[PDB]
C-alpha cells in the first residue's frame, strides 16, 4: 500500500499518483512534490513498459541530506537556495518558509528570520533528547496553547493536518498537540505513518 511521506494520504490517481524514488525508496504524491503533470522522461521513450524510473531531488544530487529545520533523516527533501536541504513537510508547516515556485515546489529560500529560530524552542516530542533543541519547532495551533515540536516529530505522532481547499484558510497547514488533537485524525495518520515505515525499512 502506497502512502505519501508528505501528507500521509493513501489515495493515488492518474492525476495525482503516489510515486517512488528508485534509489532511496521514498514515496510521495506527485502533487505533494511539485512533480505533477510533467511529460514522460526522455529515458522513458525507449521502454515499452507502463512505467518510467523516478528519483527524488536529493538522489539526483547524490546526497543523503539532513534538514535545516529538524533532526530527522527520513522522508523527502528539497534543496535550498544556499545549497542546503529541507523536508518538504518542514517547509510547508514552519512559518516564514515559502517555495519559490509553487508549481514545482522549488527551491526553498530560508531567511535570517528562519535561522534565528534555530534551537529557540525545545521539541516536546523528540525521542532523542540530544536533538530536541536543533532545528525549528512549530507550535500547537489551538487557542494560545504553547506546546512545541519539530514538524517531523509531530508528523510521526499523527498531529499534522491540512485544511481542505474548499475551506479557504490562507495557511491551510496546522498542527495540534496531543491534548488538543482530533483523535480520529490522529488514529489514521499514525496508522499510515506506521505502514509507511514498514514499507520503506
Amino acid at each position: 500500500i502506497l502512502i505519501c511521506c508528505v501528507c500521509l494520504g493513501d489515495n493515488s490517481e492518474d492525476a495525482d499518483e503516489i510515486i517512488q524514488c528508485d534509489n532511496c525508496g521514498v514515496t510521495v504524491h506527485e502533487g505533494c512534490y511539485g512533480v505533477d503533470g510533467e511529460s514522460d522522461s526522455i529515458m522513458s521513450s525507449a521502454s515499452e513498459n507502463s512505467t518510467e524510473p523516478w528519483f527524488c531531488d536529493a538522489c539526483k544530487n547524490g546526497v543523503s541530506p539532513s534538514c535545516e529545520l529538524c533532526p530527522s533523516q527520513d522522508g523527502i527533501f528539497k534543496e535550498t537556495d544556499a545549497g542546503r536541504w529541507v523536508h518538504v513537510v518542514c517547509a510547508l508547516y514552519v512559518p516564514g518558509v515559502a517555495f519559490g515556485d509553487i508549481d514545482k515546489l522549488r527551491p526553498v529560500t530560508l531567511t535570517e528570520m528562519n535561522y534565528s529560530k534555530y534551537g529557540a524552542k525545545e521539541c516536546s516530542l523528540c525521542e532523542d533528547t540530544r536533538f530536541a533543541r536543533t532545528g525549528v519547532c512549530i507550535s500547537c495551533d489551538a487557542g494560545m496553547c504553547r506546546s512545541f515540536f519539530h514538524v517531523t516529530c509531530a508528523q510521526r505522532e499523527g498531529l499534522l493536518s491540512e485544511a481542505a481547499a474548499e475551506e479557504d484558510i490562507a495557511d491551510p497547514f496546522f498542527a495540534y498537540c496531543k491534548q488538543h488533537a482530533d483523535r480520529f485524525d490522529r488514529k489514521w495518520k499514525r496508522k499510515n505513518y506506521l505502514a509507511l515505515q514498514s514499507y520503506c525499512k
Binding site: 492518474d14 517512488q20 528508485d22 511529460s39 514522460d40 512505467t51 518510467e52 524510473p53
Partner: peptide, 9 residues
Amino acid sequence: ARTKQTARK
C-alpha cells in the same frame, strides 16, 4: 518508479 502519462487513463 512513476507511471508514464501515456499509460494513464
